[PDB]
Amino acid sequence: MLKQKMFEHYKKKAILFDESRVPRTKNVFYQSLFSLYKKVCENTENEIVHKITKRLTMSRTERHPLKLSNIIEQANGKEIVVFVGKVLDDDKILEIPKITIVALKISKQAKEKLTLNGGEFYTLDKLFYISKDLKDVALVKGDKNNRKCTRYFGASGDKGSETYPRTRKGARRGERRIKNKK
Amino acid sequence: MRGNQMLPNNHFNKGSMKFKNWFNQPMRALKRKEVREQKSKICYPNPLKKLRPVV
Amino acid sequence: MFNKKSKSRKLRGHVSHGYGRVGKHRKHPAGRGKSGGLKHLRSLFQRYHPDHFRKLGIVMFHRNKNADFTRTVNVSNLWGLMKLEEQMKFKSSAEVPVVDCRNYGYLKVLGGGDLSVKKPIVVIARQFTKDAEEKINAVGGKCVVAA
Amino acid sequence: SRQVNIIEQDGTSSRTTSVPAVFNLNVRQDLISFTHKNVAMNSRQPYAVKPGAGMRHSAKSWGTGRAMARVPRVRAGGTRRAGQGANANFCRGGRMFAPTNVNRRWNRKTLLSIRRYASAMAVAATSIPAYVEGRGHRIEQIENIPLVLSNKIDTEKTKEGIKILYNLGLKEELDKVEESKNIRAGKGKWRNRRYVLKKGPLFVYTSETSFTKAIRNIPGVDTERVENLSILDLAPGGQAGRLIIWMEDAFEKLTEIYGEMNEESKFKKGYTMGMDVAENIDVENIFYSDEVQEFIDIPNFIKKDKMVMEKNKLAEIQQYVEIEERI
Amino acid sequence: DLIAKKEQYNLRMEELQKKQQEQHLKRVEENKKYAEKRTVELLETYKKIALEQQL
Amino acid sequence: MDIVNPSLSKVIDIINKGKSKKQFKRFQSWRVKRVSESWRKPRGIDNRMRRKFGGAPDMPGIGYKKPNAIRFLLPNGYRKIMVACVKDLEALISLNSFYCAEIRHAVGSKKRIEILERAEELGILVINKEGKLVK
RNA sequence: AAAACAGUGAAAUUGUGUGUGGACCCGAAUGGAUCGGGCCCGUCUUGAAACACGGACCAAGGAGUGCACAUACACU
């Protein structure tokens, strides 16, 4: 009995907002938006709201961007999608399904494409009007591991290591990967 | 030398090496303007530059 | 942040400036530059730079960059070279677009992905992969080789 | 949006004009400060010490065994200078630590896109009364902001020029500048920076007119063209909201220069006027909206008291009684 | 408009605070009466349990 | 001057008699004249004060900090604000329950007269009231 | 080599007068004898009060800086 009660408590506390974190930006429009979400969190247990509030506090690198096609790929049949970050255009795609994106920012070329295909962009202040009970929303996230600088982490002189050496490079010059597997 | 870096290669060994600064950049620009202007008076109706082919 | 105080300003009053009392801060305890690499620094090289001590490959005593410089595009990006207003005309229109990759500084076409719109297109370039040719011919398009 | 009234020499108003689109843009005091800091460093002149100062003399160490510290010393005879301590930074007349040098980086870069955006939102702030008052310009007597002087001002003399400015209500502002002159505190008063004055109105013109040389001798009046308007003039000291007298031609030109919202300027290629992450600073007030109040849950106000363990206080919370049973 | 709606919240919450407070005291008063009776029971059942052992 | 804040009048003496008179003199400032009295933390390898042997003096630290309510309070029961203009007193008009004014040293006689006249009518306590203007 | 104003005029150090003590610091006091605790700092060192070294006294000066090239983080 007790062991379950304990674990179910830990799982909850792992979701909820910390309330001793604050965004480092001196932008007063960004700090306004955080204040709203903070006052909502202390009056609710709903996991989507808590997740959103934690993400506004993370760094620029933690808020990695997504391309339009990848949002649709991760939307998994939902109508509204939410994203704490910036939405960029995909040059490989022209036609898209009708969709509503609530997000932090969008690029000029992406917004046009979204509009031509039918669909809307709303800023995160408006979420509560777009949705009544937060049942029809999906929440989506990028991954900072996909940066090109992650190819150099680790040691290239370990056995079976996939990492690349930091090297001078030319037509003949350059250190190779030699301890990997193929 | 410690840790992981691209191996150095910085060429500052030679003690006889000269440095060139560019503090004169705005002033020399103003002189080139004033020379063109006076040259343009000496041949007033005519353009300062000649016609050239396309290659 | 756009500005921050330095560490040196906090170390005023503390004896060793953060280099230790026993180890100290001497002039060059390990040697100058990247020297020592087959000897006392062998562990750094074998961990991070294993392909350093070697000679490799074919030699040409003079090379010309302009004669070998090239840039590559995939089939899935062909429609993307056009402006968005232009794309939206040719999508509905009865006419066939004629795209020349030379005009955007591309010389070779690769077979990555599927074409954005499944209607005919004429593509001009210097070289095509076998996959690219098959994909363009599949939609009733045409590949034209040119200098 | 609004109309604005033009003002003729005599103080009459009759013709009216629409207001440019730039004035609807929100203000970022972070970006104005950042841009000010960088640009202010581009007007510096280099300084350095002489390239081998402190190193002139013939000096050598005496080595150990003489009961003296092993600093280099001056080779001489016949003078009190013999045997004194020469080259080091801890010596009188020696060389300084890390001599200052001309190769330092004097200037600083800032992206063109930030420079354009900062100037746009500086212009915007010149028409919010809260900001203009906040800088310390006094505007109690001025009828409305912004001010737009007509063309067909035929003024040529300073005498008639001041009469015009007085009729626009600027008397108290101008007086505030004249009374301000004082000698600076510190060594700057020796290095050609002797007198300090408070900032006053900036006049912005675009077309060449006689009014420019009529007003310029009045203390605290400043002049610039609209096409090359600088952030040092628009946000002095990195605080925004300078008071501006527009000329009628110049005010109409703001539409060509900054364009219209979600369009591209023809005069500034590659630049467009953008959107913030939230529309206003007041968004915290959305909590009280109907849509939010349906979503949340009813609070509990009843809260537990802090633990007490003192003998007497505890005895009133838990009265103990003995038992005789031995079970 | 929202500045007016801010007042309706403050009023609504004061009513709720007074309400919950009144409901709390009644629970506290109820609990005190149950506790009196129960202590009399248990002090007697100890006495019974002891006699069972003597027997 | 013999004046007291009315809100603390029956308490001020308890407060005053409760304040510490401890001083934290620098170690060995009693031994050589070249070391001033101003506190610096000892950082020697052998030092008896850093190592906290019995019989060495005490070191500063957070434990000695006063309660938040009592802190900064002058012995008359007010907090102080500096003034140099007539237009400065205008700020105190809401705060005169807990704050009092102290005219800056460099303000001269002719100007001080104008400050004191305004202080009387607004009802603000000035603690340097006598000042230079006794003559 | 030194040496600016016929300004202001600190500390080391000296004389005279008036007070308090017998090297001095911390804690606690008397009308008054005093009571309790404390070895000289800085530094290398397993380990310093050391029969380890530097230090007669005061003022002023006196030691992680600039540029180039890759880099991880925070901010635009």
mmCIF file of C-alpha atoms in Angstrom, chain B residues 1-9, chain C residues 30 33-34 41 44-45 48-49 52:
data_model
loop_
_atom_site.group_PDB
_atom_site.id
_atom_site.type_symbol
_atom_site.label_atom_id
_atom_site.label_comp_id
_atom_site.label_asym_id
_atom_site.label_seq_id
_atom_site.Cartn_x
_atom_site.Cartn_y
_atom_site.Cartn_z
ATOM 1 C CA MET B 1 48.909 21.576 -23.855
ATOM 2 C CA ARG B 2 45.806 19.895 -22.400
ATOM 3 C CA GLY B 3 42.296 18.846 -23.438
ATOM 4 C CA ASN B 4 40.746 18.578 -26.926
ATOM 5 C CA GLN B 5 41.303 21.354 -29.481
ATOM 6 C CA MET B 6 42.170 21.707 -33.128
ATOM 7 C CA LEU B 7 45.994 21.574 -32.996
ATOM 8 C CA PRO B 8 47.305 25.173 -32.783
ATOM 9 C CA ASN B 9 49.323 26.510 -35.791
ATOM 10 C CA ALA C 30 55.196 20.873 -20.243
ATOM 11 C CA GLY C 33 53.631 24.422 -28.729
ATOM 12 C CA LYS C 34 52.389 20.945 -29.786
ATOM 13 C CA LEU C 41 52.086 13.677 -24.566
ATOM 14 C CA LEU C 44 46.641 13.054 -25.562
ATOM 15 C CA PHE C 45 47.407 12.160 -29.187
ATOM 16 C CA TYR C 48 41.962 12.732 -29.458
ATOM 17 C CA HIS C 49 44.181 12.788 -32.567
ATOM 18 C CA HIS C 52 48.232 12.681 -36.921
#
